[PDB]
Curated annotation (Swiss-Prot), chain A:
Heterodimer; with KPNB1. Interacts with ANP32E. Component of a complex containing CSE1L, RAN and KPNA2. Interacts directly with CSE1L. Interacts with PLAG1. Interacts with APEX1 (via N-terminus). Interacts with FRG1 (via N-terminus). Interacts with ARL4A, CTNNBL1 and NBN. Interacts with SNAI1 (via zinc fingers) and SNAI2 (via zinc fingers). Interacts with BAG6. Interacts with AIFM2; this interaction likely mediates the translocation of AIFM2 into the nucleus upon oxidative stress. Interacts with RSL1D1. It is found in: Cytoplasm; Nucleus; Endoplasmic reticulum membrane; Golgi apparatus membrane. This is Importin subunit alpha-1. It comes from Homo sapiens (Human). Belongs to the importin alpha family. The keyword Transmembrane does not apply. Functions in nuclear protein import as an adapter protein for nuclear receptor KPNB1. Binds specifically and directly to substrates containing either a simple or bipartite NLS motif. Docking of the importin/substrate complex to the nuclear pore complex (NPC) is mediated by KPNB1 through binding to nucleoporin FxFG repeats and the complex is subsequently translocated through the pore by an energy requiring, Ran-dependent mechanism. One of its GO terms (biological process) is positive regulation of type I interferon production. Expressed ubiquitously. ARM repeats lie at residues 3-41, 42-81, 82-123, 130-171, 173-209, 210-249, 252-291, 294-336, 337-383, 384-423.
UniProtKB/Swiss-Prot annotation, chain B:
This is Nuclear cap-binding protein subunit 1. It holds the Pfam family MIF4G_like_2. The modification Phosphoserine is found at residues 6, 21, 195. The gene is NCBP1. One of its GO terms (molecular function) is RNA cap binding. Residues 27-234 form the MIF4G domain. It comes from Homo sapiens (Human). The keyword Transport applies. The modification N6-acetyllysine is found at residues 198, 664. Gene3D superfamilies: 1.25.40.180. One of its GO terms (cellular component) is cytoplasm. InterPro entries: ARM-type_fold, CBP80, MIF4G-like_typ-1, MIF4G-like_typ-2, MIF4G-like_typ-3.
Curated annotation (Swiss-Prot), chain C:
MRNA binds at residues 9, 74-78. It comes from Homo sapiens. Changing residue 76 to A: Does not affect mRNA cap-binding. One of its GO terms (cellular component) is nuclear cap binding complex. The chain holds residues 35 to 118 of 156 of the full protein. This is Nuclear cap-binding protein subunit 2. It comes from the Eukaryota. Changing residue 45 to A: Abolishes mRNA cap-binding. GO terms for biological process: alternative mRNA splicing, via spliceosome; cap-dependent translational initiation; histone mRNA metabolic process; miRNA-mediated post-transcriptional gene silencing; mRNA 3'-end processing; mRNA cis splicing, via spliceosome; mRNA export from nucleus; mRNA metabolic process.
Length: 423, 756, 80
């Protein structure tokens, strides 16, 4: 005998499922099996032809308890790998869960939303597959007209994010134009666990071409995404920082928006943040900002950000410096001459030189590329030599020459052209 | 220049989640524990539950508070048990206790503005015993008790009454603490409460008392009684011997923990919306002498007695919907020492069944409960119920006809269960008394019920041949035009015609044509009704087939109100031997619009009913005709409040029914008011008559009739207070004015006291 | 249907129990509407249609399981 519906043998559950009070305790037995702490017997249950039986319990319009107990079970089976989640899909379960959304029972539809989120959250296929089954309307409808439950709301915000995540292909554009509006009013909620999955859902959307990003920008969420960057709960900043950092990777006009949102006032704190991973992203977004037009670069300057980049490059670890490097390179690229001087005046020389030893030959090519930029700016000032001297007095000239005898052909071609043209 | 995000990540979040636990199924297991606790030992499970709840606080800090506050307002019969479970959660977590006191206080202020003054007290007495757990500072508790008694100096009286009660009701628990750290202002506060009680007006007492007698047990006002109890307590050095306090087994853990403060409470000001409780009257019929065999019964003034009855009362409230669970939890009642549970469990059930105005639950509820306790306590409880009955009987002389009714009902429906077995000779003292006076009347009305439940001859057997002089007469009809050679009777020949008409199943159109042979026509009805009922006098069904079949015939006759009466008058002259048959016919004649309520009211106060006007069936017909009127008034009001909701082409079609249902309401409410107004008109009439008469003829007023009628007038107010409290203006200006006989005007003034 | 019905199947009744008795008793838990004895002579049961359901519930809690004519009354919910 089993003590209650705890730790039933697989042989028992099958016998109980095949009276409804048996089918209920058995379905519940599978539930407790599929939700145990250690390695759930997901493989064993699927090979017992139980999956199809669980589908019927969903359509139990009369027996509420077994609908819930069953949905719970399947959900913990679609939580496994891609092959296990497939078996559920193959069992025509997708159409069923979308039908369980209608249920007046709070514990059922909420358990159906979750159930759908797992299936869609699998890959791009099952995502679009679920969306094709027109699950967008009901799920969004469950958000029509607070004061709704707290825990429930999260499962929706999560399942929705899984309807935007992953690429190749990207979630149907029409399925986004309709979901976005919802993701906006949600963005103005109060619950962290909800605001978190919100930003994630947004970042997923803004993880593509300028059209996708355009959709998310023309909705007016941007000003809010920057309002959360300063928030305390770290699980809120990361998802929003990505959403923002991904926005700037688009058009120059899509940057002037996030810049006018007040992002250039938060970065100073974002950079000197103890959380190292937040430094990387922060200074990463910095690059795409300085990559834009000139006047925009002139705004990165106005907010005294440059002196920060220097420190982010002269003290911070490597992965944050690699980004601080691009931010400097792009800066010198599109930047103006009177801005280049201001960058040299901030002592960008030595800090930039010290990195001419890294093992990543790519970052090296970039630094040389950034050097040439400063020189071409120095040329139109007739101060060609004056610059060369600085790069020499700080050992830089040696670091550049040490490249002459490097393994990468490009590094030689590049380090040599610099030595020749300006030395 | 611009670069995509390095690394092939996308956040590092779950593509799929797996439900490892649950909230709902958990908050049902937390609720279960917060409930089943106190069913191993007590201090063992409590201590265990203390931590188990804490290990669920990080996630359900706000939920756990929901259950505790709820359990605090729904289960007062466990007060202490939970004041401990909180004291422990306070001994381990401080911020928790504060997040609870702040919760209770808020929850309280809600049920106070929601006119739930009964649940309100439950919480008040909870905060009190929380002082006995170092969870609340003694001062801040007295602070709330300084603004409770402050109300007496503020408005209605019932309002002041409550706060003085909610305060004094708690002292049996938190009195030993209050009068220890602040005994200075304690007596000073008592000096305030003291005066107010004396200042109060005890006008409602005569109406709310079950027994108007003084001996042996007086029925004291629910406050003046409790007060004397608190006095006997203050004198006993605030020492009580019953209340179970588990926290006295946790002196270690508690003393260490700190305390909280009660925010300065200001009672929600009095509005014309607030509905305060009606004054009670402590029911008492037992003292220690009644039970010399068992433990000594806590005094009538003993503060322990205030608790025993209290907890027992609430225990019934919590499980009244289930008799097998009510009686169970009732018998298994705790206590510090041994007490006569039989004599309390019983005195409590009767304390409710006889409570005035109305009981907390349906009358038939207590009938089964007491019967269930006799199965659960075979050789201990029954004897107590038997004596309790004998005692009730001997004290019928000064009882209240209202209560007397429920006693007649319960007793008869009780015997009906146990073969009607009852030593009747026990009540031989009635064989030699005026039939009008209680005891003799009681035995008849009771033997009348036993008959209805069984039958005539059945009762004739069980009662001694000497009691056969009180047995209900052979319930057979009286056919005026029977086999009697009363040939010279008006319309004798015609009555014989109808006789064969019904005996061969006559049509409606037929019976009419025959009635065209009778000299509004009284005799035309005196023949049709007389004839019909007789032919269909075999059983109830045949009679119901009669009123059904020839419904049209009746409708045409009983069209005018005067005609409607004559139908009843005749229908009575035929069944003046079988009161039960009258009740149902008077019932089905109202639900089929043959006659109406306004007609019945008069027919009750008519001269044909002036002989049995004192009998019971006359009122089990009146307080059943009014019920139908109310269930009809509410039926529409409801049906209208569900048509307005539904309103949320079709618009007009629906707004149309709305108007028409509102005029239907205003109409039903009208006839209802007319009925009640007719009642008092007939009462004030027959009462003023009996007064002007006796006060002139030089005789005493207090007659068996005057008493068995004056209470029938009072019973109207009690059993229908909510509604009558709507005609106050009308009544005060038309019916009961200052120019009405004091003895009749008083009965109405006693009514105004219930909620004023 | 039973979740809204106002009629009771009364079983285990004395073969001598009369409609009158049934009436007097069940009238305790509210007003009654209709009563129909069982035949083929008596059969030992009947139906008791109330008006409201609240009255019907009270007959299941109190008038149900009690004794009448030295027999325990057994009442169940009926579908009209």
């Amino acid at each position: 005998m089993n003590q209650g519906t705890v730790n039933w043998s697989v042989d028992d559950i099958v016998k109980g499922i095949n009276n409804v009070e048996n089918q209920l305790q058995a379905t519940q037995a599978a539930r407790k099996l599929l939700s145990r702490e250690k390695q759930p017997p997901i493989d064993n249950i699927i090979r017992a032809g139980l999956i199809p039986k669980f589908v019927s319990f969903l359509g139990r319009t009369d027996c509420s308890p077994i609908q819930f107990e069953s949905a719970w079970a399947l959900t913990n089976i679609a939580s496994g790998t891609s092959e296990q989640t497939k078996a559920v899909v193959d069992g025509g379960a997708i159409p069923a869960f979308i039908s369980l959304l209608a249920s007046p029972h709070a514990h059922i539809s909420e358990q159906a939303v979750w159930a759908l989120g797992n299936i869609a959250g699998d890959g791009s296929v099952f995502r679009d597959l679920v969306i094709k089954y027109g699950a967008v309307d009901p799920l969004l409808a469950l958000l029509a007209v607070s004061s709704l439950a707290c825990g429930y709301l999260r499962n929706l915000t999560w399942t929705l994010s899984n309807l935007c995540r992953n690429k190749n292909p990207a979630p149907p554009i029409d399925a986004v134009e309709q979901i976005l509006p919802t993701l906006v009013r949600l963005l103005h909620h109060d619950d962290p666990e909800v605001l978190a999955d919100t930003c994630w859902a947004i970042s997923y959307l803004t993880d593509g071409p300028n059209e996708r990003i355009g959709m998310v920008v023309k909705t007016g969420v941007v000003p809010q995404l920057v309002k959360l960057l300063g928030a305390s709960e770290l699980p809120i900043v990361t998802p929003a920082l990505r959403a923002i950092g991904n926005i700037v990777t688009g058009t120059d006009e899509q940057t002037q928006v996030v810049i006018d949102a007040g992002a250039l006032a938060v970065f100073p704190s974002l950079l000197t943040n103890p959380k190292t991973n937040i430094q990387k992203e922060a200074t990463w977004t910095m690059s795409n900002i300085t990559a834009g037009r000139q006047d925009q670069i002139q705004q990165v300057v106005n907010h005294g950000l440059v002196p920060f980049l220097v420190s982010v490059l002269s003290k911070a670890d490597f992965k944050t410096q690699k980004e601080a490097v691009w931010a400097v390179t792009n800066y010198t690229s599109g930047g103006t001459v009177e801005q280049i001087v201001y960058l040299v005046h901030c002592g960008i020389i030595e800090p930039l030189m010290n990195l001419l030893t890294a093992k990543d030959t790519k970052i090296i090519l970039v630094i040389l590329d950034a050097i040439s930029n400063i020189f071409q700016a120095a040329e139109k000032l007739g101060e060609t030599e004056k610059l060369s001297i600085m790069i020499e007095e700080c050992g830089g000239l040696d670091k550049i020459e040490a490249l002459q005898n490097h393994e990468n052909e490009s590094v030689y071609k590049a380090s040599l052209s610099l030595i020749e043209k300006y030395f | 220049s611009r670069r995509r995000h390095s690394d092939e990540n996308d956040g590092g979040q779950p593509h799929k989640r797996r439900k490892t636990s649950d909230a709902n199924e958990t908050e049902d297991h937390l609720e279960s524990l917060i409930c089943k606790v106190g069913e191993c030992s007590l201090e063992s499970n409590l201590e265990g539950l203390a931590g188990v709840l804490e290990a669920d606080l990080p996630n359900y800090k706000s939920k756990i508070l929901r259950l505790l506050c709820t359990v605090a307002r729904l289960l007062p019969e466990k007060l202490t048990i939970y004041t401990t479970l909180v004291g422990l959660l306070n001994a381990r977590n401080y911020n928790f206790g504060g997040e609870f006191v702040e919760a209770m206080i808020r929850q309280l202020k809600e049920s106070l503005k929601a006119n739930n003054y009964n649940e309100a007290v439950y919480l008040v007495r909870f905060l009190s015993d929380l002082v006995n757990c170092h969870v609340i500072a003694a001062p801040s508790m007295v602070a709330m008790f300084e603004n409770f008694v402050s109300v007496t100096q503020e408005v209605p009286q019932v309002r002041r009454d409550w706060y003085v009660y909610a305060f004094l009701s708690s002292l049996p628990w938190v009195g030993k603490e209050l009068y220890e750290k602040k005994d200075a202002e304690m007596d000073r506060i008592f000096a305030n409460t003291e005066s107010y009680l004396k200042r109060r007006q005890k006008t409602h007492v005569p109406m709310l008392q079950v027994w108007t007698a003084d001996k042996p047990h007086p029925q004291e006002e629910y406050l003046d009684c409790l007060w004397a109890q608190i006095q006997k307590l203050k004198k006993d050095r605030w020492q009580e011997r019953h209340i179970l306090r588990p926290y006295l087994a946790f002196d270690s853990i508690l003393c260490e923990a700190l305390q909280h403060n009660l925010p300065p409470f200001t009672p929600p000001p009095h509005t014309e919306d607030s509905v305060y409780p009606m004054p009670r009257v402590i029911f008492r019929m037992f003292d220690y002498t009644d039970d010399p065999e068992g433990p000594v019964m806590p005094g009538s003034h003993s503060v322990e007695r205030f608790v025993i009855e209290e907890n027992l009362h609430c225990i019934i409230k919590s499980h009244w919907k289930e008799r097998k669970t009510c009686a169970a939890q009732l018998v298994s009642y705790p206590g510090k020492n041994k007490i006569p549970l039989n004599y309390h469990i019983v005195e409590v059930i009767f304390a409710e069944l006889f409570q005035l105005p109305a009981p907390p639950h349906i009358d038939v509820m207590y009938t089964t409960l007491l019967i269930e306790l006799c199965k659960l306590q075979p050789g201990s409880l029954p004897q107590v119920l038997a004596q309790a009955t004998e005692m009730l009987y001997m004290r019928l002389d000064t009882m209240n006809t209202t209560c007397v009714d429920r006693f007649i009902n319960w007793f008869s429906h009780h015997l009906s269960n146990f073969q009607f077995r009852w030593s009747w000779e026990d009540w031989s003292d009635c064989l030699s008394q005026d039939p009008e006076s209680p005891k003799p009347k009681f035995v008849r009305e009771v033997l009348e019920k036993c008959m209805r439940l069984s039958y005539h001859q059945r009762i004739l057997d069980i009662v001694p041949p000497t009691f056969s002089a009180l047995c209900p007469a052979n319930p057979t009809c009286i056919y005026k035009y029977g086999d009697e050679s009363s040939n010279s009777l008006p319309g004798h020949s015609v009555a014989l015609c109808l006789a064969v008409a019904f005996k061969s199943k006559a049509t409606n159109d037929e019976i009419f044509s025959i009635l065209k042979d009778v000299p509004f026509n009284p005799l035309k009805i005196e023949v049709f009704v007389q004839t019909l009922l007789h032919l269909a006098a075999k059983s109830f069904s045949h009679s119901f087939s009669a009123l059904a079949k020839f419904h049209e015939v009746f409708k045409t006759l009983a069209e005018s109100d005067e005609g409607k009466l004559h139908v009843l008058r005749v229908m009575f002259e035929v069944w003046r031997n079988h009161p039960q048959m009258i009740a149902v016919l008077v019932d089905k004649m109202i639900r089929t619009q043959i006659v109406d309520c306004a007609a019945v009211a008069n027919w009750i106060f008519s001269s044909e009913l002036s002989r049995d006007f004192t009998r019971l069936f006359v009122w089990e017909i009146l307080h059943s005709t009014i019920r139908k009127m109310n269930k009809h008034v509410l039926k529409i009001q409801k049906e209208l409040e569900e048509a307005k909701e539904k309103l949320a082409r079709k618009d007009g079609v629906l707004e149309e029914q709305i108007e028409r249902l509102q005029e239907k309401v205003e109409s039903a409410q009208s006839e209802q008011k007319n009925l009640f107004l007719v009642i008092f008109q007939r009462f004030i009439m027959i009462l003023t008559e009996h007064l002007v008469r006796c006060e002139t003829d030089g005789t005493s007023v207090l007659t068996p009739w005057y008493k068995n009628c004056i209470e029938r007038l009072q019973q109207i107010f009690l059993q229908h207070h909510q509604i009558i409290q709507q005609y106050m203006v009308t009544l005060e200006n038309l019916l009961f004015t200052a120019e009405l006989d004091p003895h009749i005007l008083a009965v109405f003034q006693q009514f105004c006291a219930l909620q004023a | 249907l039973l979740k809204k019905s106002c009629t009771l199947y009364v079983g285990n009744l004395s073969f001598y129990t009369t409609e009158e008795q049934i009436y007097e008793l069940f009238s305790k838990s509210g007003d009654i509407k209709k009563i129909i004895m069982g035949l083929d002579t008596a059969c030992g049961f009947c139906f008791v249609e109330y008006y409201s359901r609240a009255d019907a519930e009270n007959a299941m809690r109190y008038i149900n399981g009690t004794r009448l004519d030295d027999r325990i009354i057994r009442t169940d919910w009926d579908a009209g």
